Specification:
Two copies of one chain form a homodimer. Chain A is mostly helical. Chain A has two domains: about 1-80, Arc Repressor Mutant, subunit A (Orthogonal Bundle); about 80-134, Helix Hairpins. Chain A has five helices and three strands. In chain A, helix 1 packs across helix 3 (about 50-65). The first copy, chain A, starts with 14 loop residues before the first helix and ends in a 7-residue tail after the last helix. The interface of A and B includes residues 104, 106, 109 and 115 of A. Chains A, B: Keywords: DNA-binding, Transcription, Transcription regulation. Chains A, B: It comes from Listeria monocytogenes serovar 1/2a (strain ATCC BAA-679 / EGD-e). Chains A, B: This is Lmo2241 protein.
């Protein structure tokens, strides 16, 4: 029930990571909702034309990050989103990534004003439009 | 002539990358200036107590990114900073890293307001204070 998406084989991001990040973004958009059943590893691999082992790797990483949950013989679902406590360690690691990225941009001559602008643009692209039912 | 710095062996960043990023940050701060001679690989490894091969790896990456320049038999220097053209490919890759990092934070429940705040804080920490001579 995930929406199909673009995969870029020349990206710096491995295919499995692209899958992880697109699923995450779709949850952020509300395109995928808590409890929603998504495609099985094999169904998904078959549909997008990707190595099933690559999709398995992505789903394992998604479950590790608690984005999805697998219930044996029942399927794979989007995990609890409402009252989840974000992993402090993941938050810490992600803040470090933000810091390092800002250092890289600043070194390359991008000023903080331009960085705020980019952050707004990317934030808006991630949040997307709006999805409803009924 | 680089300033000594903290290395965190439990960081998600490999030691060589920590060295690359600290040198870059010191250039951003003006602690290291264009043309300034820095420690040789062996001098630096000896001083910080790191594997010389790790320092060599960092210096290779710094030269790849055009942060430093090595002149055979003369030493290693901070590369041109004034009229350098930032690699469009590196800029593009770094912008992608910003986007992915923002997605990760937003997924973890950090709002764009908090992200702008973090960006300002990290930007200020990178820029640092002020270094002069005379």
């Amino acid at each position: 029930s995930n929406a199909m998406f673009t995969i870029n084989t020349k990206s710096q991001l491995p295919i499995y990571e692209q899958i992880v990040q697109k699923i995450k973004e779709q949850v952020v958009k509300g395109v995928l909702q808590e409890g929603e059943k998504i495609l099985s590893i094999r169904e998904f691999a078959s549909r997008i034309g990707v190595n099933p082992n690559t999709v398995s790797k992505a789903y394992q990483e998604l479950e590790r990050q608690e984005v999805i949950i697998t219930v044996k013989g029942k399927g794979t679902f989007i995990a609890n989103q409402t009252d989840k406590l974000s992993s402090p360690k993941k938050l810490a690691e992600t803040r470090t990534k933000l810091k390092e990225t800002i250092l890289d941009l600043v070194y390359l001559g991008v000023n903080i004003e331009e960085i705020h602008k980019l952050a707004d643009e990317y934030s808006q692209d991630i949040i997307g439009g709006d999805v409803v039912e009924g």
